[PDB]
DNA sequence: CGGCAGTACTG
DNA sequence: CAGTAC
DNA sequence: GCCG
């Protein structure tokens, strides 16, 4: 009950504290872009706890009883109830909107955004004309609007099928699965996360590099962000009315398929919760394996096996959307 | 008092 | 390594 | 920010 990975994410669909969480999310984002990662994490978990709670919180004692809600978070909750506003919202640093603008460049995080801000930059025009940009950041800036748009899941299907058909031309036995938000059933997707493997345990070897050359040669790939080991990049379906879309690809041996599928399906906060739980049980969970701590690799032929070994009820991908 | 997921790319 | 991202 |  203290573990989100032990609960269905559909509990959030009936948020009875939206007036609270809408204001806390503003603070959470402010701490995040300013680099206060751990304070922001605490806010993120408190927001999920509030979103999934069964009733509107009405008392300081009720709030404190909720896991992920402590004294400080309770005090903020009582303020929004009594007064309808949260004073701290009127005292967020004026740098935050600009820091958010900059850190939405792919490849630029809090450290780069703060440095640019200290150098006097305030707009993407300033970044374009005056900032020093890595190769990655230049692609991010070129695709600034593209990378902030989410595509309809129907388009993600088309992208998945494009990768799959190019892969299976090399070996008809290859398996390709779109993971991430697509597999969790969301109506829109920030990118497409394609997992590739081969049931024979070995014929996945070598195809990653040939697959990319195939997709480049047919013009499907339009920019590469990372292209050693795994692929993070940019694609565009052919024809009119098409946008550049983010595409990630990972190729894994079949022996790791369940753990890779689990990792790549997420959500990110679901994974972090499941991994933290594994740690408390003397185990370690990664996209490669569930193992004992420093270790023995535990047998996980299917996703269900990972849940069972952690003592968790199985959750379909749609219920992992934390 | 100290962790807060685990891994992997770039330069 | 620090910074960034999945 | 929260929690053990
Ligand atoms: O910090 C992270 C980020 C992602 N992941 C895993 C889970 C996530 O679902 C998967 C793909 O990452 P994306 O950034 O593509 N996120 P997702 O597909 O969930 O949402 P969207 O792409 O629609 O924003 O990688 C993590 O484990 N930790
Ligand atoms: Cl939500
Ligand atoms: Cl499925
Ligand atoms: Cl290869
Ligand atoms: Cl043991
Ligand atoms: Mg995704
Ligand atoms: Mg992705
Ligand atoms: Na960024």
Considering the domain A151-251 in this protein, what is its CATH number? 3.30.460.10
**Ligand 1 atom nearest to CA at A267:** 9
**Residues around ligand 7, an ion, CB closer than 5 A:** A 191, 193, 248
What is the 3-state secondary structure of chain A? Answer: CCCHHHCCHHHHHHCCCHHHHHHHHHHHHHHHHCCCHHHHHHHHHHHHHHHHCCCCCCCHHHHHHCCCCCHHHHHHHHHHHHHCCCHHHHHCCCCHHHHHHHHCCCCCCHHHHHHHHHCCCCCHHHHHHHCCCCHHHHHHHHCHHHHHCCEEHHHHHHHHHHHHHHHHHHCCCCEEEECHHHHCCCCEECEEEEEEECCCCCCCCCHHHHHHHHHHHCCCEEEEEECCCCEEEEECCCCCCCCCEEEEEEECCHHHHHHHHHHHHCCHHHHHHHHHHHHHCCEEECCCCEEECCCCECCCCCHHHHHHHCCCCCCCHHHHCC
Cα A13 from Cα A241, distance rounded (Å)? 33
Domain A266-320: homologous superfamily in CATH: DNA polymerase, thumb domain (3.30.210.10)
- What contacts A154, CB < 8 A, 6 or more positions away? none
Among residues A187, A181, A178, which one has the least CA distance to residue A158?
A178
Considering the domain A96-142 in this protein, what is its CATH number? 1.10.150.20
- The verdict on the CB of residue A321 being under 6 Å from ligand 1 is no
| Every domain of chain A and the residues it spans | 4-91, 96-142, 151-251, 266-320
**Resolution in angstroms for this experimental structure?**
1.9
Common-topology check for domains A4-91 and A151-251: no
- The verdict on the CB of residue A268 being under 6 Å from ligand 1 is yes
Please tell me the experimental approach by which this structure was elucidated: X-ray
Distance from Cα A82 to the centre of ligand 3, integer Å: 45
C4 C1' – A297 CA distance, angstroms? 29
**Ligand 1 atom nearest to CA at A271:** 27
Which pair of structure tokens corresponds to residue A83? 């007064």
- The verdict on the CB of residue A189 being under 6 Å from ligand 1 is yes
Distance from Cα A192 to the centre of ligand 6, integer Å: 5
CA distance readout (Å), A167 to A144, A174, A189, A249: 29, 7, 22, 11
Considering the domain A4-91 in this protein, what is its CATH number? 1.10.150.110
């Amino acid at each position: 009950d203290k573990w989100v990975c032990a609960q269905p994410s559909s509990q959030k669909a009936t948020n009875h504290n939206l007036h609270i969480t809408e204001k806390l999310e503003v603070l959470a984002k402010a701490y995040s872009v300013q680099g206060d990662k751990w304070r922001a994490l605490g806010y993120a978990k408190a927001i999920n706890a509030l979103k999934s709670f069964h009733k509107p919180v009405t008392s300081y004692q009720e709030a404190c009883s909720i896991p992920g809600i402590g004294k400080r978070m309770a005090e903020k909750i009582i303020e929004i109830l009594e007064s309808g506003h949260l004073r701290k919202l009127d005292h967020i640093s004026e740098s935050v909107p600009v820091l958010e603008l900059f850190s939405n460049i792919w490849g630029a995080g809090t450290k780069t955004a703060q440095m640019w801000y200290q150098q006097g930059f305030r707009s993407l025009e300033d970044i374009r004309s005056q900032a020093s940009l890595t190769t990655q950041q230049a692609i991010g800036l070129k695709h600034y609007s593209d990378f902030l748009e989410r595509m309809p899941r129907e388009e993600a299907t088309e992208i998945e099928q494009t990768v799959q058909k190019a892969a299976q031309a090399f070996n008809s036995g290859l398996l390709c699965v779109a993971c991430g938000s697509y597999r969790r059933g969301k109506a829109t997707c920030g990118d497409v996360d394609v997992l590739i493997t081969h049931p024979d345990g070995r014929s996945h070897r070598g195809i990653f590099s040939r697959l990319l050359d195939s997709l480049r040669q047919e013009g499907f790939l339009t920019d590469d962000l990372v292209s050693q080991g795994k692929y993070l990049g940019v694609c565009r379906l052919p024809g009119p009315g098409r946008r550049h879309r983010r595409l990630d690809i990972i190729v894994v041996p079949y022996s790791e398929f369940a753990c890779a599928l689990l990792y790549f399906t997420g959500s990110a906060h679901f994974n972090r919760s499941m991994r933290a739980l594994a740690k408390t049980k003397g185990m370690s969970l990664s996209e490669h394996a569930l193992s004992t701590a420093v270790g023995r690799v535990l047998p996980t032929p299917t996703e269900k096996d990972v849940f069972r070994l952690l003592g968790l009820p199985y959750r379909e991908p749609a219920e992992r959307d934390w």
